[PDB]
From a paper:
At the core of [name]-1 replication initiation is the OBP, a 94 kDa protein encoded by the [name] gene. OBP consists of two major functional domains: an N-terminal helicase-like domain (residues 1–535) and a C-terminal origin-binding domain (residues 536–851).
The first structure, representing complex I, shows OBP bound to modified [name], where the removal of six base pairs from the AT-rich region stabilizes cooperative binding of OBP to [name] but prevents unwinding initiation. The backbone contacts involve a network of main chain amides: H782 bonds with the D/G23 phosphate, K762 engages the D/T24 phosphate, and both T750 and V757 contact the C/T52 phosphate. This key residue makes both backbone and base-specific interactions: its main chain carbonyl recognizes the D/C26 cytosine's amine group, while its side chain reaches deep into the major groove to form hydrogen bonds with both C/G53 guanine's carbonyl and D/G27 guanine's N7. Specifically, substituting D/G27 with thymine in Box 3 would create a steric clash with K758, offering the first structural explanation for how OBP differentially recognizes Box 1 versus Box 3. This precise arrangement explains another aspect of binding site selectivity: substituting D/T24 with cytosine in Box 2 would disrupt these R783-mediated interactions, providing a structural basis for the differential binding affinity between Boxes 1 and 2. We identify multiple basic residues (K793, K802, R810, K746) as well as Q743, Y786, and potentially K780, engaging the DNA phosphate backbone through an elaborate hydrogen bonding network.
Author numbering:
A (entry chain A): 16 to 433, 451 to 843
B (entry chain B): 16 to 434, 451 to 843
DNA sequence: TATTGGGACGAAGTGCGAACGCTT
DNA sequence: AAGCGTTCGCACTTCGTCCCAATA
């Protein structure tokens, strides 16, 4: 291969430098330069110590950048003991799911009269009939208690502040605009603030200087963490070593002697070699894995050397960390980020397999996960970075560094350095949006991802080394290492594809969800909150050409209810069709293997558009929502005739034409589709052979049944419309009494008018039905489905908001 | 046929009512109802009279809704004579290309101190070194004249104000934010304002009340138009009558025996029948057509009854309107909307073929066009509305009317009645009237809405409108019957017009292609808005070949990769750009000359394409590539070529090899011809040891650019590096060249003295030097430099640039 | 050969009779 | 503090998908 370029050395140096800026590693140099009136100090020896809060010279805002295990919680309790003058002093402590409040609430046994809001079952609150006074909260739950907070507090604590600010960008975030304004009001008005994170950065210090001026901010920088039981040492391994894995997992029956390959060690230090050495040597080990796919493989490998291997991921029952002392090997994925830490001196070493992926965990999540085991008896942490999946050129380019350093550390909010109003958050949301964006973008590139992870380890005082460079690494050495890793990672994929666990206990729903194709599919058609097992059930249905056709029809109908100009402009319809009804979709075949399928484009969409126009109006009239299960209204055979009769002969003509289409124009007019529609019409009673209602119900049932897979099911409802008996409001009761001209206003009260209907219920008996959407199809984004924006939602907004301009125009 | 429903009668009544509200037909009721302190008056008898401008009680703002031909220009001149208290009183008059300023500037001879900006000449009026004191302006040039404008004027006149505000929404609008701020300053600050349009509406009256309060606004409603020309009578015809056209354009050879078609009269009065009657009767006729396709057919028909037939459209040489008195028939299209009016009493009657289309002219444009001939000697206007193309259910629904009337006449800015992101940007002025532009374009989807709008505009200009067989009144059921008839005839007649299409005896294919919806939609997605239809036909002929089509898509993808740089980084984002640009359906022109749609089939594995586009996007950026600008901004030599490839040479070699030897036909870009021709080209390249590194590098570079994108490495005529030709070098570019070859100098800063140095040292700059050149087609592509008003594609790329992929199976 | 009817059990209701927020 | 409107618990029933046992 080619020798290392000077450009490769500048790429490296730029990536490291931007990583250092994003997580606050530059803070001691940047503060004096850019905010000269803000005081700063560094504490390199022993635990951190915050300023004496009772002194008149102690500033209103203090911000702390100090390691996990630097003594922060002890310095905070000391600072609160000094800050709190009286029981009349109010206090607010905000935290996050990433670092549970229960640890603070436990250690705060040291302080009088402080309590925490239960994020579960928040009723029966301790400060009953009063606003909260001395309170611990998690930001993810803050909107629940916002109206029962004091308007202002005497002390504000933000713990893991960058993790707190990170929640604003989560898809689960709720009442965002309120939580923005609430936090901003507290920041602008509390007379003492303390804000702490291992990664508190220049933009936080800038923001607090913006709200309160340099002379009221102080910064303290920790560069010490507790030795001994927490003196962790990290090693990046060069090679996965699947040649050992495949030889171990080999069936023991045949002799199967070795081929003349993998004879040289190629720098050895394999992930699997090093792991086997610990397992054979009798060590207790814990293994983080980014992917379930690999977690299952390494569990199989561990189950050869031991019996007692625990495996934890989202689709396993949640094992509490107290149980982990029972096992020789514990394998987990990022799910333990939601749970508590494991404290006991049980494990000798830790292994980690990290694979950046566009829809994967971010490196800051990975770091959180690696921390969940607090204590390691031998102090080893071995990391393998799988760069297949992440083979792109860097995002932390020299151009971006030159930009950011020119603007005094002010980052661009998106990768084009020199925008449209696609979001509308407040000061807080806009200030830190850059950090969320680069945490997700850099996953595209292994070099950037590695540099971020290395930065996070270094800022927490973990000594990081790379194999064969066990002192310090020059840019050329890094580029050689990283070049080697990309090659190893790329060749190992075939071994991991061969070894992919397909025994019944191996989770196909989890393994499917780690595929990029599935993430894209989910992002375009489906709701974000659907379970992987629901998706596999849909993808199995999509494998059949009939199931796939019905899926696309149903997704088009939903688009037409979301974009009502699609029902009117053929031009807009062609944009919606090209987007939702052409391209590639993931399916699962009968073997259980994931398999992509093309949706061929259609030259003439006119028959489809006419049909969906008709069906969209009748869908709207029946209050259709696939997510809600189908039709909101009940309807009877008379309503069916009323729905069809305005355009009856068009429905007849279009279903006939679809049954006899001369050309196989794309997906929806393929041979099986037109055959099925013809077969359906061959069974339909002729237009004069039965009552108008009988023919109308037959036709309606064929349209909904064949095209969308939607069943006209009989209803047990006592009364028409949407209303269940027990939920019937007074206004709807009056409507029902008037609809039959029943006696009215005997009394004004609900219970009287209810008692009338419950006597006259027999007058409301009859044939009654609902449209039911199939089992799949309930997981689709619909007009009712609230969702944070993406490319598809914004495209539909554009198609709704912007009109078609006249083309060949005159000046 | 089934009877007309009461729901159709509500649809009709809603459509009419919303049309009335949009063009200010409701103004006499709505002002008393919503702004009681704003005085209003009705002038039903004789020409309009504005308030006495010299009175102490006469209000600061007056706004006038009055017909074309109602006397407005005389009332304006009278009002100005009264409003101008002194020789030093300043005046600004703003108008539009639709309402051309020279008619005012001519009649303003009576106030001969007033002058107009010669926006066409673009002369350096700033040489006067003083503000313009009494000025007439075309709104689209207002920014350029911005400097010579008194910060405030004593009198502000807005002429065809609605037509003026309409320019803000034009694609060709320039420096919008500046023109917005300028007009909004003037409206807030000028001591007297008068604003006039035949369609001045409630939202303008509301906006002026918003800036100046009800007590400072007064409204005049005119309902009279001068007889002799605006005594025009309009009749909507139920049938096109293509049976007569077919019988006429039939060759003289065959016997053509009779058939039962139109043996029953179908109540008569066809477009072509009525036209034939006037042509045979010796009348002089003018014909508006919405489409060139139809204009050429009616020109062929007229050339049977007469010799002297003129025809005018965007691809004809645009002859001056004064010449029209020479002809028995003049056929024209929207080209005359921007042109001048014809005043002499030549034409007897006027015919109009109007066809709503999503990419066509709006009905207000059509109306302006009909207004181009001032006077018709027999007063007749006959209109045929072709609803094929416009068969959708209405946009002016009862629910929209209920919304608008509930909000006191405040329209929603889009068809969904809900408050959505600020995808487009503008001031108060732009946002206030955006709704009018939106509904002007959307209603083209529906013939009923389009007809009601055109009928409204005719009525607000005092033209008496009738429908055939309905002599004085038309109930909602009668209207719905008429529409049902029209929609049938219009759909029936399309086959006749397709048969009778000219078959290209050099007959103007580019205009007939440009009226296709598929082509409009293609141009919106891939091309610049301003390209000529003749360049589009040249591209669509190339697109017919699978090789030409492959190169086009590769080049469009490259430009997208330069626009959306995360596409070069995230395979998820690349898949969204690929799915959008490189899959779907595109229009082509086959060897016969007929238009033909072609599929771009989707690709299961785009990784080979993405790898190669990543390698080309970097290289292109380094070469300052821009297809519009013709190719590479930089010149480069064979030494640069080796430096471009060498970081990834093994990848370029492997990818072009694999692209040659791909085992699977995975969509368009990996089709059999594509892989075969890349293998042929690659196997024709010299082996790595056979030639110098630079020779191999240039061979590989030439193959990649040449086969995949169709771009030629062309030898440059330049004496010097960069982009300068000899006689066009100047001080800065000269100094930048004198940095080379260590030509240290102390010569003076004047261009020719420094040029004299390079004209000696030129021998040191000579060598093998090249540019990449885009083919003839492909210069019409929307590139990263191509400024354009937003559309769905521009906004999709914004979203892919701004929004990051979020972790999917997400932590709880 | 493949019909066919029955068991079997999730989804989606009933509806008495009650809780419960609140403003009278 | 109880008169009122909304809304839910629990023990039931109806409908229809599914496949297995019984044979048209």
């Amino acid at each position: 291969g080619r020798p290392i370029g000077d450009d490769e050395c500048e790429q490296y140096t730029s990536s490291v430098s931007l990583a250092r800026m994003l997580y606050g590693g530059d803070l001691a140099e940047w503060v004096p330069r850019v905010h000269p009136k803000t005081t700063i100090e560094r504490q390199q020896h022993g635990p951190v110590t915050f300023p004496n809060a009772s002194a008149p010279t102690a500033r209103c805002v203090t911000v702390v950048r100090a390691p996990m295990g630097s003594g922060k919680t002890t310095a905070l309790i000391r600072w609160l003991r000094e800050a709190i003058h009286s029981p009349d002093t109010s206090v607010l402590v905000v935290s996050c799911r990433r670092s549970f409040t229960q640890t603070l609430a436990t250690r705060f046994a040291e302080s009088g009269l402080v309590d925490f809001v239960t994020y579960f079952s928040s009723t029966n609150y301790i400060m009953n009939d009063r606003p909260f006074h001395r309170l611990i909260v998690q930001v993810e739950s803050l909107h629940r208690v916002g109206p029962n907070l004091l308007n202002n507090y005497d002390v504000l604590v933000l713990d893991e502040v960058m993790s707190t600010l990170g929640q604003l960008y989560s898809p689960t975030m709720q009442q965002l605009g309120r939580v923005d304004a609430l936090m901003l009001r507290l920041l602008r008005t509390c007379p003492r603030i303390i804000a702490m994170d291992a990664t508190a950065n220049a933009q936080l210090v800038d923001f607090l200087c913006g709200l309160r001026g340099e002379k009221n901010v102080h910064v303290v920088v920790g560069e010490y963490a507790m030795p001994g039981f927490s003196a962790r040492r990290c090693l990046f391994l060069p090679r996965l070593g699947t040649e050992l894995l495949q030889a171990a997992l080999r069936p023991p029956g045949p002799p199967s002697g070795p081929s003349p390959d993998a004879s040289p060690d190629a720098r050895g230090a394999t992930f699997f070699g090093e792991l086997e050495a610990r397992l054979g040597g009798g060590d207790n080990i814990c293994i983080f894995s980014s992917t379930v796919s690999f977690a299952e493989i390494v569990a199989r490998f561990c189950r050869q050397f031991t019996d007692r291997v625990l495996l934890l991921h989202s689709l396993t029952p949640l094992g509490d960390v107290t149980t982990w002392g029972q096992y020789r090997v514990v394998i987990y994925t990022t799910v333990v980020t939601v749970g508590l830490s494991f404290d006991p001196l049980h494990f000798d070493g830790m292994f980690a397999y990290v694979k950046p992926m566009n829809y994967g965990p971010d490196m800051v999540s990975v770091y959180q996960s690696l921390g969940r085991v607090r204590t390691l008896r031998k102090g080893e942490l071995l990391i393998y970075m799988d760069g297949s999946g992440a083979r792109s050129e860097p995002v932390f380019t020299p151009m971006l560094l030159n930009h950011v350093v020119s603007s005094c550390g002010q980052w661009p909010a998106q990768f084009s350095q020199v925008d449209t109003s696609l979001g509308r958050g407040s000061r807080i949301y806009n200030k830190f949006r850059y950090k969320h964006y680069f945490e997700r973008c850099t996953l595209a590139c292994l070099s950037d991802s590695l540099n971020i992870l290395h930065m996070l380890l270094t800022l927490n005082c973990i000594r990081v080394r790379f194999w064969g460079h066990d002192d310090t690494l020059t840019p050329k050495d890094f580029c050689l290492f990283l070049r080697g890793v990309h090659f190893d990672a790329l060749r190992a994929q075939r071994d991991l594809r061969e070894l992919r666990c397909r025994d019944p206990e191996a989770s196909l729903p989890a393994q499917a969800a780690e595929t990029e194709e599935v993430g894209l599919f989910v992002e375009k058609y489906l709701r974000s909150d659907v379970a992987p097992a629901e998706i596999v059930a849909l993808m199995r249905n999509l494998n059949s050409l009939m199931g796939r056709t019905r899926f696309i029809y149903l997704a088009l109908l939903e688009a037409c209810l979301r974009v009502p100009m699609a029902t009117r402009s053929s031009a807009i319809f062609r944009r919606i069709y090209d987007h939702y009804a052409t391209g590639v979709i993931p399916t699962i075949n009968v073997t259980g293997e994931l398999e992509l399928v093309a949706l061929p484009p259609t030259l003439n969409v006119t028959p489809v558009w006419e049909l969906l126009c008709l069906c969209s109006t009748m869908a709207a009239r029946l209050h259709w929502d696939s997510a809600a299960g189908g039709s909101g209204r009940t309807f009877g055979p008379d309503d069916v005739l009323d729905l069809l009769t305005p355009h009856y002969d068009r429905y007849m003509q279009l279903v006939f034409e679809l049954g006899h289409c001369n050309v196989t124009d794309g997906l929806l007019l393929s041979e099986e589709a037109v055959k099925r529609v013809a077969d359906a019409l061959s069974g339909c009673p002729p237009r004069g052979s039965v009552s108008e209602t009988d023919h109308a119900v037959a036709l309606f049932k064929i349209i909904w049944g064949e095209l969308f897979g939607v069943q006209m099911a009989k209803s047990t409802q006592t009364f028409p419309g949407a209303g269940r008996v027990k939920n019937l409001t007074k206004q709807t009761i009056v409507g029902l009494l008037d609809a039959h001209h029943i006696d009215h206003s005997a009394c004004r009260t609900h219970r009287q008018l209810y008692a009338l209907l419950m006597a006259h219920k027999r007058e409301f008996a009859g044939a009654r039905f609902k449209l039911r959407v199939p089992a799949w199809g309930r997981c689709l984004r619909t007009h009712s489905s609230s969702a944070n924006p993406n490319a598809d939602i914004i495209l539909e907004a554009a198609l709704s908001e912007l009109p078609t301009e006249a083309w060949p125009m005159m000046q």
